[PDB]
Design a protein around this ligand. Structure first.
Ligand SMILES: *C(=N)c1nc(N2CCOCC2)nc(N(Cc2cn3ccccc3n2)C2CCCC2)n1
Length: 219
């Protein structure tokens, strides 16, 4: 696997979005992964509708603003036969009736792949696939108020995750020791973190569970 990867550089990644006061991080994580796989497939980067996922993917197990899972979102897209663009179906930050319209579908998927629960497997997936949906333990004030640098939380769990995000790459800080990170796109707007991103500690014992529930859609 290369020593660093940043799929933003290759065109795979839309600007940072903001989920607002809705428990829809899973929908943002899933749209980010499918944005990347649709870009690999077609060469077009098209922002996808989280609202479509929030409003419509109850049968697959999602719960709107009460949470959900990226794999359930990928199963919805396969069952539904499509997913609308963000432009056609903009984000409202509350769970509403389903308004999917196939005319405005711009993405599809054929299922999903669950990555083995190990950081080396995650690294190989990031290097060979594109952006990867992951779950993390974000439930510390240190993450809420993260500003810059490598995030390392000694109380983080590797087994109990509570937030869905997107790994867009990995690398290292030049600067001392234990300097590797996962480049993670959050859905808390651009003013959180580093332009909306967090450098997450890498190869530190599966810090915050980043490799424990990683997946991506097949297209
Ligand atoms: C993301 N914004 C988010 N929010 C929540 N909430 C907890 C419940 O109330 C609102 C915020 N939870 C997550 N989770 C945990 C979760 C919740 N649900 C509901 C239905 C099925 C699975 C499920 N997981 C994360 C979502 C992806 C990884 C855990 N996220």
């Amino acid at each position: 696997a290369p020593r660093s990867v940043d799929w933003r550089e290759k065109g795979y990644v839309t600007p940072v979005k903001n989920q607002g006061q809705c428990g829809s991080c899973w929908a943002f994580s899933a749209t980010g992964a499918l944005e990347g796989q649709m870009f690999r497939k077609t060469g077009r980067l098209i922002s996808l509708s989280e609202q479509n996922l929030v409003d419509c993917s109850g049968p697959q197990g999602n719960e709107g603003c009460n949470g959900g899972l990226m794999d359930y979102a990928f199963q919805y897209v396969q069952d539904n036969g499509g997913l609308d663009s963000e432009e056609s179906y903009p984000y409202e930050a509350t769970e509403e009736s389903c308004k999917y319209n196939p005319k405005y579908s711009v993405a599809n998927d054929t299922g999903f792949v669950d990555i083995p629960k190990q950081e080396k497997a995650l690294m190989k997936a990031v290097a060979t696939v594109g952006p990867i949906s992951v779950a993390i333990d974000a439930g510390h004030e240190s993450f809420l108020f993260y500003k810059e640098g490598i995030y390392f939380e000694p109380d983080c769990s590797s087994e109990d995750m509570d937030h869905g995000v997107l790994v867009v790459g990995y690398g290292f800080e030049s600067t001392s020791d234990n300097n590797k990170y996962w480049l993670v796109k959050n859905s808390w707007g651009e003013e959180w973190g580093m332009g909306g991103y967090v450098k997450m500690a890498k190869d530190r014992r599966n810090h915050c569970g980043i490799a424990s529930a990683a997946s991506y859609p097949t297209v």
